[PDB]
Amino acid sequence: MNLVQDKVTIITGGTRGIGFAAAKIFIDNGAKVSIFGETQEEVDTALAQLKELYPEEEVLGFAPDLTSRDAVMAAVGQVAQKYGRLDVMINNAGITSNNVFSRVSEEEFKHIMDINVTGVFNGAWCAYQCMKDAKKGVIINTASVTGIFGSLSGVGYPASKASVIGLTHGLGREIIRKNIRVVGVAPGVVNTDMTNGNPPEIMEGYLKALPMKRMLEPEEIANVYLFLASDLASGITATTVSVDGAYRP
Amino acid sequence: GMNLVQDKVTIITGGTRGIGFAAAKIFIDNGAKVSIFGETQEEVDTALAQLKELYPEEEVLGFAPDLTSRDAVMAAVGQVAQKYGRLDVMINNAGITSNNVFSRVSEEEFKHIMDINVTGVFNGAWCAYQCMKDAKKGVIINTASVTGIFGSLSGVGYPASKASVIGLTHGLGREIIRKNIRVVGVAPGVVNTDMTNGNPPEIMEGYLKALPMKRMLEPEEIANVYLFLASDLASGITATTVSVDGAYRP
Amino acid sequence: MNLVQDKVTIITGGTRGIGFAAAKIFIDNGAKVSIFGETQEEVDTALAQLKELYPEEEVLGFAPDLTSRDAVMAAVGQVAQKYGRLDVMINNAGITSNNVFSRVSEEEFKHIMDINVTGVFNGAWCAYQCMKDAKKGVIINTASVTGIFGSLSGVGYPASKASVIGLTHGLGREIIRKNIRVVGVAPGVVNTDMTNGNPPEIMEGYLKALPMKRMLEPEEIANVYLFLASDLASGITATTVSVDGAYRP
Amino acid sequence: MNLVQDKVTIITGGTRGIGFAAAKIFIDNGAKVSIFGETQEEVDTALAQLKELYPEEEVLGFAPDLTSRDAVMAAVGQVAQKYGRLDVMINNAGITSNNVFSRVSEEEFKHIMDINVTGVFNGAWCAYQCMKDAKKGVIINTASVTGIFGSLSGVGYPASKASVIGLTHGLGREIIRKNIRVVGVAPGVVNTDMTNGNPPEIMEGYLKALPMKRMLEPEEIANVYLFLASDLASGITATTVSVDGAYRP
Ligand SMILES: NC(=O)c1ccc[n+]([C@@H]2O[C@H](COP(=O)([O-])OP(=O)(O)OC[C@H]3O[C@@H](n4cnc5c(N)ncnc54)[C@H](O)[C@@H]3O)[C@@H](O)[C@H]2O)c1
Ligand SMILES: NC(=O)c1ccc[n+]([C@@H]2O[C@H](COP(=O)([O-])OP(=O)(O)OC[C@H]3O[C@@H](n4cnc5c(N)ncnc54)[C@H](O)[C@@H]3O)[C@@H](O)[C@H]2O)c1
Ligand SMILES: NC(=O)c1ccc[n+]([C@@H]2O[C@H](COP(=O)([O-])OP(=O)(O)OC[C@H]3O[C@@H](n4cnc5c(N)ncnc54)[C@H](O)[C@@H]3O)[C@@H](O)[C@H]2O)c1
Ligand SMILES: NC(=O)c1ccc[n+]([C@@H]2O[C@H](COP(=O)([O-])OP(=O)(O)OC[C@H]3O[C@@H](n4cnc5c(N)ncnc54)[C@H](O)[C@@H]3O)[C@@H](O)[C@H]2O)c1
């Protein structure tokens, strides 16, 4: 199976969790993969892990400030200049929130809006600049089940993830004439560092609320990134695919 | 090369032409054991002969049950389950459209589109569930439409029936996920099949140019989404409908 | 307050629950009200109740088979003939389902599809025929929260109520050029004969788990019918308004 | 008609357009109105216009930086101090975008996200702090049709307005236990300074694409704010009402 054969791919937040599982699955399927991480330390750790798994595969790693379009452009530009093209952009880096409304500070709301929305806008804009003249490409934006069904706390999380769905819808409709597809992915509860850090009572809570009686594995989200990036999904754009196993927050 | 549905016993309703027939081919290519349903025995015979030319060593069963009769659907689903010992995938793809102005929509026309597009999907999903529930495994795929989400400017029975399919998929998916059976919808935009061809090229030239992709989707582009959704790659996808419309808005 | 002053109104399922609460609120706001019921007995009971409340008000009552468009046309036609016009049509009559999928018979699925969807189509079609030449009117269709968020059982209920939302969207887009508005109302859990079952010991736990800690009252749905039928809602069409107090099935 | 009798109301962006039409309709319906505007000059102009219409009515006016929660709290706090309570908060201030994706600068995307989302979050948070102990109140957030159906350009506009819908959904579900309702309003194309200044070619396109063959008037949106703020809408929360006359971008 080589669903993304010879596709030049960038995965933001590709150092751990869903993004890292996607790096592996995309390399397994013939893609040329580059990853972004928050810090250079996280990037070095992930590149060393990928070097053990794939000793003959070259994987580029960068740590741009996702809130700065110039910093994202510098990193995206290096990938496009090394391979002469950019086929796939996955705006997967993201954070969550669970604070009760009264305890949501200005700083916390600004930060989740910055990373989850401005980070996605910057990545999609920089990918588009490298894809527009080639008149081909795929931009994948990671939303959440909370972007559709809301949440009971951490208002910045459904607000930012609903914005990602809205950005995906509008951008997809706008740039389809340049043969560039824009698709969203809205996961439910996934077994990563984002969810495994919670207290045991919250973990117990999730596991009883999940209709599948298990969290999804990062591979189950990464397999959807894989299909959506492949030419099999040539009819899918300006929409968000729910991958939540019927979980409802 | 690919074998995304290897050894999966699959039934495709409306598998004699358009999207369903393209799915029959793509599913056989990917290792599935395929059975098709068609509206008439003549359509079934034609499709089986076409598939026999393409795949001379492949056995494909064909049936023409009245989709509005659950006993007729159960008899056909039962024969497939009896022959292979299980049922892994059910695709409720058979459907029809409408474009009549509201004043000209007869009682008979509204009843018929509601019967085929909704009762036909309910009957197929119910009969599949009965053959899947003890195995605690399976995938049910229901074909909706872009009109089920964005409405239409005419033929009210078409968005009404296709929105019902999305609602059925959502509710059924939430209900039977505890039996490890996934229920997923597919909402196509405008697809190049017998459903959409008939108009002269002069009329169609301006229509195609106004489409966001400047072309209709091909039946293979919908069938490839059936393939992914039926595969173990979509293990996290249930109680939802995937839009495959190339940004087309009715 | 006379939000529907002199508006000739038909309310299907106006003999009890939401429909009956709407009959009272519409009479209070100056409308000329006619009600439909399943049986002649229900119609006689409701008309007598409205005579004790409003002795000087004339209310017409009919019991047409909602699955027969000719029977609905005969009743709608009599109202339009008596007042010379039809201003408001409320397709409020409906039923629910809670049977587990295996136990949903052909007959049960056919019946809920017939009453909840064909009944709404027939009422909307007959209203349209009496409104189209006047180039004014409002058609209100009662959906449900299950039409948007699904359900855990009784598949015919989300299937039929999602169809009502789809019919409302398509019909609204089609006939807005004739200055006829088509709007949906999606209630959550309302205190009527439809939810009047279980003893209080069992109910106490259920009510406590509801986001508002109570069901909605039929007046709370009828007040939304009132606004939507008024000229205040002149910009609202081809959409469904959620009146569920944040309840999620 | 006095749908919002004795209700202490704050309207952000109440100096012109929809917000100003709402100021008038809310005063007509018995509310105690306070307005916010971008500049002190706009506030002075609107207060003078309202003094000519209502010479005996006192209307407070403020121009806080909506991106600063402390500046919004200072203004909201003064209203709550003067009347001892806050009954209604309308987060109506907003801006639009129509730039092609390549021409959307970092600055433009940041600004629309700041005003349309952080401005709504700040207003809703400050209102909640003044409403939570009273265990009653209504927060109205202005989204847009583009938040549901996307757009063909100005990606910041559907992204920010979809975020407003997501914020409304999540916040509504979270604070309904404090008897505070959170509702959204999604207008189509409204005849205000936001749209009326466009070149004839763009105007022609709008008028052709509008199924009603006219734009909605600001009163048609303000009448929906009125109903949603009234006790008639007691069952409506954690949802967005479309007021678009079947217009689709
Ligand atoms: N884990 C879940 O249950 C869940 C639920 C729904 C949505 N999602 C979304 O899935 C995506 C991936 O999440 P995950 O669970 O794999 O998370 P993770 O914590 O396992 O990894 C997140 C990745 O994003 C990067 N990232 C985070 N904050 C960053 C910042 N400030 N700057 C730059 N990069 C940053 C990290 O470096 C890391 O590589 C996110 O968009 C998340 O919101 C996850
Ligand atoms: N083609 C499009 O533009 C379009 C758009 C949106 C939705 N869809 C949906 O896709 C599905 C497949 O459609 P298609 O375009 O391939 O159509 P098609 O006409 O090419 O084939 C339809 C198939 O369904 C079967 N079928 C139709 N009526 C039937 C009946 N009364 N009883 C039993 N079987 C019946 C036919 O035998 C045939 O095999 C349908 O559900 C259709 O509504 C298609
Ligand atoms: N009550 C709830 O919790 C709730 C929830 C969501 C949606 N709804 C919807 O609200 C609407 C009103 O329901 P309600 O709770 O007031 O119910 P109800 O049982 O109190 O009243 C139903 C009314 O519809 C009529 N009706 C029912 N079946 C009919 C048939 N076969 N033919 C003709 N008339 C028929 C009855 O005579 C009666 O007047 C329905 O469409 C229902 O689906 C109710
Ligand atoms: N007019 C339309 O076609 C339309 C379409 C859909 C949504 N909307 C939404 O409706 C709402 C009202 O818009 P309108 O058409 O009445 O606009 P308008 O331009 O007529 O008025 C906007 C108001 O918001 C204030 N405002 C704008 N930017 C601000 C800022 N930086 N800081 C503080 N206050 C600011 C202005 O002072 C003014 O009072 C907005 O949220 C807008 O996005 C309008």
- CB of A146 within 6 A of ligand 1: the answer is no
**CB of A37 sitting under 6 A from ligand 1:** yes
> Which of B12, B13, B16, B19 to probe ligand 2 with, by most ligand atoms within 8 A of CB?
B19
* Count of other CB atoms within 10 angstroms of residue D230: 20
Domains, chain A, with CATH or none: 2-249 (3.40.50.720)
Amino acid at A61: G
B185 close to B144: Cβ distance less than 8 angstroms: yes
Q: For residue C247, what is the nearest residue in chain A, using CA coordinates?
A: A149
Chain B contact for C150 (CB, 8 A cutoff):
yes
Q: Which residue type, as a one-letter code, is found at position B47?
A: A
Contact C241/D at CB under 8 A: yes
Q: Which residue's alpha carbon is nearest to atom 2 within ligand 4? A: D190
Angstrom distance (rounded) from CA A90 to CA C46: 61
For D149, the closest chain B residue by CA position comes to B150
Q: Please, are residues B239 and B169 in contact by the beta-carbon 8 Å criterion?
A: yes
Where are the alpha helices (H) located in D29-118, listed in sequence order?
40-53, 69-83, 106-113
Closest of A174, C152, B110 to residue D153, by C-alpha? A174
Choose which residue among A97, A114, A192, A216 to substitute to test ligand 1 binding: the one with the highest number of ligand atoms within 8 A of its C-beta. Answer: A192
Q: Which residues in chain D are closer than 8 Å to C176, comparing Cβ atoms?
A: 211-212, 245-246
| Residue from the list D100, D150, D171 with its beta carbon closest to the beta carbon of A169 | D150
Shortest CA distance to B141 belongs to which of B76, B73, B179, B94?
B94
Q: Rounded CA gap, B92 and B127, in Å?
A: 11
Q: Which residue of C has its CA nearest to B170?
A: C150
D192 Rama class: left (phi>0) / alpha (psi -120 to 50) / beta: beta
Ligand 1 midpoint to CA A46 (Å):
14
Q: Is the CB of D235 less than 8 angstroms away from the CB of C224?
A: yes
In DSSP notation, C165-179 reads HHHHHHHHHHHGGGT
Backbone angles phi, psi at C90, to 5 degrees: -115, 110
Contact B250, B146 (CB under 8 A): yes
DSSP 8-state class, residue B35: E
Q: Are D35 and D8 in contact (CB under 8 A)?
A: no
Backbone angles phi, psi at B89, to 5 degrees: -135, 135
How many angstroms does the Cα of residue C161 sit away from the middle of ligand 3? 12
Inter-chain residue contact A159 with D170, CB threshold 8 Å: yes
Which of A41, A45, A92 has the most ligand 1 atoms within 8 A of CB, as the residue to mutate? A92
Q: Which of C224, C226, C235 sits opposite D243 (nearest CB)?
A: C235
Indicate the residue of C235, C236, C245 with minimum beta-carbon distance to D235.
C245
The reply to whether B3 sits in an annotated binding site is no
Q: Please name the residues in contact with B9: beta carbons below 8 A apart, sequence gap of 6 or more.
A: B32, B33, B35, B80, B81, B84, B86, B87, B88, B89
Amino acid identity, position D88:
V
Q: What type of residue is C74? A: A
Residues of D with catalytic function: 157, 161
Chains that touch D (3 or more CB pairs under 8 A): A, B, C
Cβ-Cβ pairs closer than 8 A, B with C, add up to 133
Q: What is the dihedral of CA B199, B204, B210, B213, to 10 degrees?
A: 100
Q: Which helix (H) or strand (E) holds B78?
A: helix B70-84
User: What single DSSP character describes residue C101?
Assistant: G
Q: Which chain A residue has the Cα nearest residue B191?
A: A235
Sign of the torsion formed by the C-alpha atoms of D144, D148, D149 and D150? positive
Q: How many CB atoms lie within 10 A of CB C164?
A: 29
Residue nearest to atom 20 of ligand 2 (CA): B18
Tell me if D242 is assigned to a ligand binding site: no
Please compute, for residue C174, the number of CA atoms within 13 A of its CA located in the half-sphere on the CB side. Answer: 28
A56 among annotated binding-site residues: no
Structure tokens at C152: 């855990």
Judge: C102–B160 Cβ closer than 8 Å, yes or no.
no
**How far apart are alpha carbons D65 and D81 in whole angstroms?**
20
CB A6 within 8 A of CB A32: yes
Portion 62-101 of A in contact with D at CB < 8 A: 69, 100-101
Separation of alpha carbons B238 and B187, rounded Å: 14
From B188, B107, B176, select the one nearest B138 (Cα to Cα): B176
A248 touches chain C (CB under 8 A): yes
- Is any ligand 2 atom within 6 A of the Cβ of residue B68? no
Tokens at D179, concatenated:
């008897």
> Which residues share a beta bridge with B242?
B186
Q: Is A103 exposed, middle or buried (0-12, 13-18, 19+ CB in 10 A)?
A: exposed
What are the helix (H) ranges across chain A?
17-28, 40-53, 69-83, 106-113, 119-131, 146-149, 156-175, 193-196, 200-209, 218-229
Instruction: Give me the catalytic one of B129, B162, B226, B248.
Output: B162
- What residue in C sits closest to D145 (Cα-Cα)? C239
- Alpha-carbon distance values, B220 to A111, B188, B193 (Å): 43, 12, 11
CB A130 within 8 A of CB A175: no
- What residues of C are in contact with residue A149 (Cβ under 8 Å)? 149, 248
A92: Cβ below 6 Å to ligand 1? yes
Q: Going by C-beta distance under 8 Å and a sequence separation of 6 or more, which residues neighbour residue C208? A: none
Q: Among candidates A217, A203, A195, A206, which has minimal Cα distance to A249?
A: A206
Identify any residues that bridge with C8 across adjacent strands, giving them in sequence order. Answer: C32
Residue A240 CA to residue B180 CA, distance in Å, equals 24
Taking contacts as CB-CB distances below 8 angstroms, the residues of chain B near C172 are 151
Rounded Cα distance, D170 and A123, in Å: 26
D248 close contact with B: CB closer than 8 A: yes
Residue type, D148: I
φ/ψ of residue A141, rounded to 5 = -115, 130
**Whole-angstrom Cα distance, residue D80 to residue D132?**
13
N residues, chain B = 250
- Asked whether the beta carbons of C239 and C172 are under 8 A apart, the reply is yes
**Which amino acid makes up residue D49?**
Q
- Kindly state if the Cβ of B43 falls inside 6 Å of ligand 2: yes
Strand order in the sheet with A137-142: A60-62, A32-36, A8-11, A88-91, A137-142, A180-187, A239-243
All residues of chain D having their beta carbon less than 8 Å from the beta carbon of residue B150 are: 149, 248
Q: Which atom of ligand 4 is nearest to the CA of D146?
A: 6
Is C157 designated active site?
Answer: yes
D144 is in an annotated binding site: yes
- D44 by Cβ neighbours in 10 Å (0-12 / 13-18 / 19+) ranks as middle
Reduced to 3 states (helix: H, G, I; strand: E, B; else coil), residue D22 is: helix
Compute the distance between CA of residue A49 and CA of residue A162 in angstroms, rounded to an integer: 33
Ligand in nearest proximity to the CA of D142: 4
Residue B188 CB–ligand 2 contact under 6 Å:
yes
Q: Using the beta-carbon criterion (under 8 Å), do D102 and A152 form an inter-chain contact?
A: no
D173 and C CB contact within 8 Å: yes
C173/D239 touch (CB, cutoff 8 Å), yes or no: no
From the list C7, C24, C157, C225, the catalytic residue is C157
Give yes or no: A157 in active site.
yes
Smallest Cα distance from A217 to chain B, Å = 9
Burial A189-228 (b: 16+ CB within 10 A, else e): bbbbeeeeeeeeeeeeeeeeebbbeebbbbbbbbbbbbbb
